[PDB]
Symmetry: D4
Subunit: 201 residues, 8 copies
Amino acid sequence: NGFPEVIYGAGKTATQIVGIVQALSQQTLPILTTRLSAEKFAALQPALPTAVYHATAQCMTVGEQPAPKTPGYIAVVTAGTADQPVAEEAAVTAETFGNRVERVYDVGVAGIHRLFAKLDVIRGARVVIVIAGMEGALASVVGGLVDKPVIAVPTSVGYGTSFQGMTALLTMLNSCASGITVVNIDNGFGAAYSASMVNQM
Amino acid sequence: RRNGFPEVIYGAGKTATQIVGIVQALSQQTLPILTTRLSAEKFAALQPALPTAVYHATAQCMTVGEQPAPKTPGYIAVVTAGTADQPVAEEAAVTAETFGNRVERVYDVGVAGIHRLFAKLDVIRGARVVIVIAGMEGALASVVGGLVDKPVIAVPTSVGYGTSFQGMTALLTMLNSCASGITVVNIDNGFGAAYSASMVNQM
Amino acid sequence: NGFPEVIYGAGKTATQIVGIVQALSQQTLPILTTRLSAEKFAALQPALPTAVYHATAQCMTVGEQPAPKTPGYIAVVTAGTADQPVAEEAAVTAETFGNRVERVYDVGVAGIHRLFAKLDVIRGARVVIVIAGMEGALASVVGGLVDKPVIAVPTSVGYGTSFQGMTALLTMLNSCASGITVVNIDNGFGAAYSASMVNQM
Amino acid sequence: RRNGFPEVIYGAGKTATQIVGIVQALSQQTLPILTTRLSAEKFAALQPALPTAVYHATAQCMTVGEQPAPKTPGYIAVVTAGTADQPVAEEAAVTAETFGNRVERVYDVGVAGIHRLFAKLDVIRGARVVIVIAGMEGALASVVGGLVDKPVIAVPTSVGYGTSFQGMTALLTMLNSCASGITVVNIDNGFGAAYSASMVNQM
Amino acid sequence: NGFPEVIYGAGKTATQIVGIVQALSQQTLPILTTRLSAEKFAALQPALPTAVYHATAQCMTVGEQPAPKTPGYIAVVTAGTADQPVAEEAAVTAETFGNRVERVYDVGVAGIHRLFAKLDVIRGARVVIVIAGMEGALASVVGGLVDKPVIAVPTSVGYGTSFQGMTALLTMLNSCASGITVVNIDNGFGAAYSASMVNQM
Amino acid sequence: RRNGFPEVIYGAGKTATQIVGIVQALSQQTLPILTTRLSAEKFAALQPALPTAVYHATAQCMTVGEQPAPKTPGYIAVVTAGTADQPVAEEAAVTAETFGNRVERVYDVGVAGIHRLFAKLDVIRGARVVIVIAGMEGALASVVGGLVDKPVIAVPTSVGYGTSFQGMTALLTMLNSCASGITVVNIDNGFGAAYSASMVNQM
Amino acid sequence: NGFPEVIYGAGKTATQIVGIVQALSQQTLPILTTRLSAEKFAALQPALPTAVYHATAQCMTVGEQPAPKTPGYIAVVTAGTADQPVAEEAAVTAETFGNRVERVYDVGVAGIHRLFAKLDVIRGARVVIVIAGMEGALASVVGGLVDKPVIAVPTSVGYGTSFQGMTALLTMLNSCASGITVVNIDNGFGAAYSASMVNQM
Amino acid sequence: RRNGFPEVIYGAGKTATQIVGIVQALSQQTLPILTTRLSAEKFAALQPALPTAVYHATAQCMTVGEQPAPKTPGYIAVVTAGTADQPVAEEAAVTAETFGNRVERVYDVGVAGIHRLFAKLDVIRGARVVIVIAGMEGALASVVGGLVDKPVIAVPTSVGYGTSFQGMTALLTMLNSCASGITVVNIDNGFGAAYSASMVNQM
Ligand SMILES: Nc1ncnc2c1ncn2[C@@H]1O[C@H](COP(=O)(O)OP(=O)(O)OC[C@H]2O[C@@H]([n+]3cccc(C(=O)O)c3)[C@H](O)[C@@H]2O)[C@@H](O)[C@H]1O
Ligand SMILES: Nc1ncnc2c1ncn2[C@@H]1O[C@H](COP(=O)(O)OP(=O)(O)OC[C@H]2O[C@@H]([n+]3cccc(C(=O)O)c3)[C@H](O)[C@@H]2O)[C@@H](O)[C@H]1O
Ligand SMILES: Nc1ncnc2c1ncn2[C@@H]1O[C@H](COP(=O)(O)OP(=O)(O)OC[C@H]2O[C@@H]([n+]3cccc(C(=O)O)c3)[C@H](O)[C@@H]2O)[C@@H](O)[C@H]1O
Ligand SMILES: Nc1ncnc2c1ncn2[C@@H]1O[C@H](COP(=O)(O)OP(=O)(O)OC[C@H]2O[C@@H]([n+]3cccc(C(=O)O)c3)[C@H](O)[C@@H]2O)[C@@H](O)[C@H]1O
Ligand SMILES: Nc1ncnc2c1ncn2[C@@H]1O[C@H](COP(=O)(O)OP(=O)(O)OC[C@H]2O[C@@H]([n+]3cccc(C(=O)O)c3)[C@H](O)[C@@H]2O)[C@@H](O)[C@H]1O
Ligand SMILES: Nc1ncnc2c1ncn2[C@@H]1O[C@H](COP(=O)(O)OP(=O)(O)OC[C@H]2O[C@@H]([n+]3cccc(C(=O)O)c3)[C@H](O)[C@@H]2O)[C@@H](O)[C@H]1O
Ligand SMILES: Nc1ncnc2c1ncn2[C@@H]1O[C@H](COP(=O)(O)OP(=O)(O)OC[C@H]2O[C@@H]([n+]3cccc(C(=O)O)c3)[C@H](O)[C@@H]2O)[C@@H](O)[C@H]1O
Ligand SMILES: Nc1ncnc2c1ncn2[C@@H]1O[C@H](COP(=O)(O)OP(=O)(O)OC[C@H]2O[C@@H]([n+]3cccc(C(=O)O)c3)[C@H](O)[C@@H]2O)[C@@H](O)[C@H]1O
Ligand SMILES: [Mg+2]
Ligand SMILES: [Mg+2]
Ligand SMILES: [Mg+2]
Ligand SMILES: [Mg+2]
Ligand SMILES: [Mg+2]
Ligand SMILES: [Mg+2]
Ligand SMILES: [Mg+2]
Ligand SMILES: [Mg+2]
Ligand SMILES: [Mg+2]
Ligand SMILES: [Mg+2]
Ligand SMILES: [Mg+2]
Ligand SMILES: [Mg+2]
């Protein structure tokens, strides 16, 4: 293994979270808490002063991460700014797992030139995580322009025929470019977990 | 007619011997007569019956009467994602040409090789209307829409296996494009798009 | 091109909106802000005094529109009053793009005589935008009575088997009348954007 | 019977040799015997077996015994959207006539040409019950419902390709009509409508 | 025709409602207002003192109904008490249209003996309206025990696989008993409208 | 075996020559050997190959070896809504009998004629487990469940046209019953129900 | 029969509940009230002092349960802690029906060793109730490891492709292991009702 | 190529005489040439045409040119739930071997008999990437994912009747796994998984 300790933040209370963190207090292992609301990080902030909270990602990391474990990096590519929350959930979990992360945000195919401008970075990552909602055309465009494993995270942003991520998920599952592999809606952590395993072979 | 255009005949309910009778009921006093979604077999059935009729095999459409030459200088670009889309692409391309519009075919420029789309980007941008035909994911419409300033009509096709859902995924992707300038028709409806593209191009 | 500046109003805050408007302050180009709530237009109204807000459409236009750019007009036809919000979103975006707009509201096929009464206007537009929800029979009736491009906007009004616009969308996609072409639910802007391109050839 | 009406026989599970046996089990001591959704082939299979039986090919229904003449002065209007709806239209029209009701057929008056519907509007308004049969979008029910003051029964049919969803879209459109006076049956269920229309007309 | 004036109560405000009622003040024709909330009937109750409000049905009737127009009656049969709101919407609209109404409530097939106990009444109506949700087995049981037109109203009560009435609607559409004819979810008015037309031939 | 019961063989992936080989791989040192969902043709294919094998045509199941006589005094009631349900009814009835349970068949007692259900209500109430098999609407489970104090297992079948959705509507209706005592299996899964009913009855 | 009195707690008010309990006051028969909110148990707690409330299960039992009616027991096995509410609804209803209940909670296949650790108990029950959501793989794993009737309850926990229990329900309906039999989402009572009938033959 | 790998050919749109022409268009100046989803009949059609071509019947794939021996010491584990998954398992196993990866096949270890999965657990854990292929419920991915520390790619297959929904239920189950390390592809897409597994293993 060699992964840190992860805490899910949805069904657990701010108290329950502190109790799990104090149980894993020894060893100086990094602890990640995902999907942790801002209000559920207010109550416990007096409890853990040495903890950091990534507001957009709703993730909280207590304990110093040492260096990256590999020189390579993972690129987190997003289609629109509405994707940045699950994107930062992915990028923060990857960085906590000891990965260098290069964020290429808001490069949707509506403005396709923006994506080509950052292609040198995207093509040089060991893994690419593409995060998009609405219509997941970005996963397919990037998938056909890189030669590295791509993990697609569809996002639940959007009303109507967006279906809170279903259309994006179906698009990514139908991606023409082979080598795209998909995770569940908003699962920015699960992508970074699989991406971290690939990067850190 | 309340829409001054050629005569159209469904083909999803009509038999071979019926097609001759339905065509002959509106034959002389009309423009060309077009028949869509007509089986590939019922053109041998009527080739002696309708000797002056033509059949476009891939398009599954039959045109009786002389096809009008382009009544307009502009052209309509029919852009296809993969070769599997050519049946509905040719239904659109034959429908457009029958209504008197020039067509420029840009086939198999799917987003997997975006470079291929850029190589033919000059022709696509030069059309007055663009018909983008795709399936599986249907991302080409979104990509083309954001690269052209002319009206785009997106046709999802039922091509594809698995979660393709016989065109539903492509239709949903196209309806949910962020690039504006995109209007959508029903799955495999290459005719309906060429019908609208013809009105835009005619104007 | 020759279109004005558009601002989406959903994910942006009233502050962020003013900052985008002040960045595009020079040139005297019209600026349109769509899907802009009444509460998100209260906060910024001291900021932009010269801006107008179309309450029903939730659209805000700062800067004087010059004349129409074409003598032709676009007809915005609605089935019921419940469709007027996305209708005005369409009509305001079209008028901001420099189109003359003729509004033919509340002519659903339940009272089909009302639609025939205004057919002289609908038939004389260069483009028709038909907006309906519940059951999109109006797009098909109008489509078969006009000889001009029709763009159908299904609306999300309604509960139960209305499916928040899905049934209307499917009906319009199955419209018997050829020449109907459909946009996404509530996308009054997208229809007016495509309609404006057609009208202003 | 708890519903004083003729004998009905499904045909979706029955074989040819079975249809003779099922009909003969309730033959003399009954009204006419009707069989719905019976294959177009298993009427040659039984035409010598049941020589006094009739078959309506388009309707896929077989009636043994003398059909009753209209026991009522009113009639039932069976209004169809396109010719593709005639199979379920005739299932409704043959079911209605077998129960002893006059039928006036108004076929192929879809909303694409609303003028056609108005030309036959006098006959439709004159019925005691109206059966509107349509598919694809299914807008005729809504249009007719708002133009008639008699009860309308709407039958969606599975006609149509693509997002037609084999009658689901039509069914949804009809259930979500704003014009009141409309009640709906299941897809392709031309019998169930004529069954209800017969009770209304009989009254 | 010969039906009263109907007012929909959903998209109209309590003020707008009073203005429509005062416009139809003359003739002494009954006016029905359906789907009219309790809070939207508080505000207008000083406006129309002579109006009655049926709380469960969310319907408001101003103006005296004269006698029934036919000796026959319509039976409103419900499966469970959760169906009573749309049931009373149906029964009140039918009674306002000049129909005698016999309410046979809470006779779901779970306790099938209760339904047989009231069968003498149900079988003697000119029309039967069966209202049920969850699983619409009651429409089919009654349909096969009566020889009169049945109109089925599926109701939106229930979570999970109830699908807010979809399962009930599909069951009723698949009713084995012929002569069932179905309306849209919760459309207690539409059933009573069609039932009233049948009863009052 | 971790579930002391006879040997079961899918039939949805197996060929005729394969069925003999799969049966012979677990033949002598076993209880009877049962094969479900096996084509009606691949029993002529093996009738000389497996001369001691029996085939129940309607059930599409083949049993090799002597069937055990009821090892219990109670019986399992297999209640069917219409004759169209007998294929999956017999899959359940043959599976139950192979496991050594008595079966009482109550076929075609759909809720359309509730009187028919009451006429055979004594036999149904007398079973230790009741299997209710229905489709289209699937109301019988709810009706039977509220009339019996023994455990009921409901099997939806894909019988039916239109909005029947090939068993989905029946499955949904049964899962959403108000009468308690009802547990549901997957569409057409007459085996899975008889498998559970056998364990309840055995106990 | 021989089952206690059950009261549904969803559509009934705290007052209506006390009135039903006082009507069934005589005989000293246990009374179970399911799906009874904490706020709907506050109001009535002065009314019934001798009643107990199972907070997690939202169930209230008034009246002393005598001994179990059978030496056998029913095992309630859950995949994650998020399943414990409907699990306790099942376990409390079973115990009120006179069954011994052995709770094997939070043994999802993610940590499959935990399930094998408690297999000796699960295999010795007369009936097994398996409760899971998200992906119902636990019903299938247990079903293939026991030789006793299993009743699967899918739970509605989860967003996105969880579909508020639909995916779990479909998985359990497709369980490879025969002998699984399924109930409706969250129907912890219905499983315990059928399980109690089996256990108490 | 922008992805340095062998030549791939769809087979869902291509005819026999077409496959020879499409292969010959990119034949000498390439790595091996692979064709997926190619009918089991159009290999007799081309076996004299392409005498140096091989066909894997179960996989429905044809490889022209010499297959590369493992260019890596690690292997890819292709784990199958039931024998009904072997067609898409072999599409994955043949795709992986063509790209130059060792494959260890672990077939028919469904969760019904978890003991079978543990007996081959050493081989599965020893792979650099694991491809888990399943249908019906698709629980194996979740079970395997929680027992291995290497990346798992889950392939749902359309195997199964009833509410299996032709792979939708399996796909949904796999996407909604709690065990992390699992990434999913589209239904029956054994190629797409072996394509990604090959890149991971190559690294
Ligand atoms: N078995 C298989 N399953 C899934 N994908 C497979 C595949 N074999 C090749 N592929 C890959 O599919 C891609 C294209 O298919 P190819 O064999 O060339 O075939 P082609 O005829 O180009 O594409 C056929 C279908 O692909 C759809 N597509 C492809 C690419 C882009 C988009 C879009 O609209 O943006 C849509 C398109 O709508 C059409 O219906 C290639 O990258 C190829 O490697
Ligand atoms: N009301 C409206 N309806 C439809 N389209 C509208 C629109 N307003 C702007 N747009 C257009 O859509 C774009 C959306 O951006 P904005 O609304 O500012 O919002 P932004 O945060 O940039 O993106 C919102 C969502 O769009 C998705 N997206 C965008 C672009 C391409 C792709 C892809 O994967 O290929 C996906 C992305 O996943 C994200 O969840 C705008 O740049 C504009 O061109
Ligand atoms: N390939 C094609 N795809 C889509 N539409 C096509 C078409 N070819 C002609 N059309 C157009 O279809 C229309 C009618 O079809 P036609 O070929 O005449 O054929 P027709 O038999 O009149 O219509 C067949 C189907 O159309 C449905 N429809 C049509 C019109 C109105 C409504 C309604 O219920 O209100 C329903 C109707 O339910 C029936 O199932 C014409 O305007 C024609 O131009
Ligand atoms: N409870 C009820 N359930 C079902 N139908 C009911 C109803 N109350 C009135 N109605 C009837 O439905 C009509 C709806 O109008 P109202 O409720 O006042 O409301 P209104 O705002 O006029 O329309 C509401 C919705 O109806 C849709 N509509 C109406 C008419 C035809 C079409 C079409 O496209 O063909 C669509 C329209 O898209 C809009 O979103 C009423 O005029 C009345 O005849
Ligand atoms: N074409 C047609 N479309 C729709 N319904 C039709 C019909 N022809 C007869 N019917 C009516 O169908 C009813 C029964 O069908 P029949 O022809 O006798 O045939 P039968 O074999 O009894 O029923 C076949 C199917 O009916 C389903 N059904 C029927 C009754 C009750 C329920 C239930 O579970 O409670 C289910 C049952 O699940 C089975 O799959 C009769 O009342 C008959 O008048
Ligand atoms: N938690 C639970 N989950 C599942 N079933 C449960 C239950 N609690 C009681 N039940 C049982 O279900 C019944 C529901 O009644 P209750 O919860 O008190 O509620 P009630 O208001 O009587 O009925 C609620 C809903 O049940 C529908 N229903 C009931 C009976 C039969 C039919 C039909 O059309 O055939 C439909 C009816 O349409 C209504 O919308 C109870 O009498 C009880 O036997
Ligand atoms: N007719 C029938 N309907 C339903 N289930 C039936 C059955 N006949 C046997 N079974 C049972 O099915 C089970 C396996 O099928 P078998 O006949 O051995 O056949 P097998 O080839 O092992 O399985 C075929 C299918 O089962 C699926 N499955 C099975 C077990 C576990 C999982 C998983 O992914 O975890 C999936 C798998 O995805 C594959 O597509 C056995 O326990 C057997 O008793
Ligand atoms: N954000 C995330 N997205 C996806 N997976 C995530 C995750 N965070 C943790 N996980 C993983 O998923 C597990 C879920 O547990 P946790 O979030 O703490 O929550 P917990 O309450 O243990 O379980 C939550 C839900 O998981 C379902 N579940 C869990 C395990 C297996 C099965 C089964 O039936 O086979 C089902 C169970 O039915 C319950 O409703 C964690 O132990 C962790 O390994
Ligand atoms: Mg943006
Ligand atoms: Mg290609
Ligand atoms: Mg554009
Ligand atoms: Mg109105
Ligand atoms: Mg027509
Ligand atoms: Mg009317
Ligand atoms: Mg009750
Ligand atoms: Mg029957
Ligand atoms: Mg019971
Ligand atoms: Mg946990
Ligand atoms: Mg197996
Ligand atoms: Mg893992």
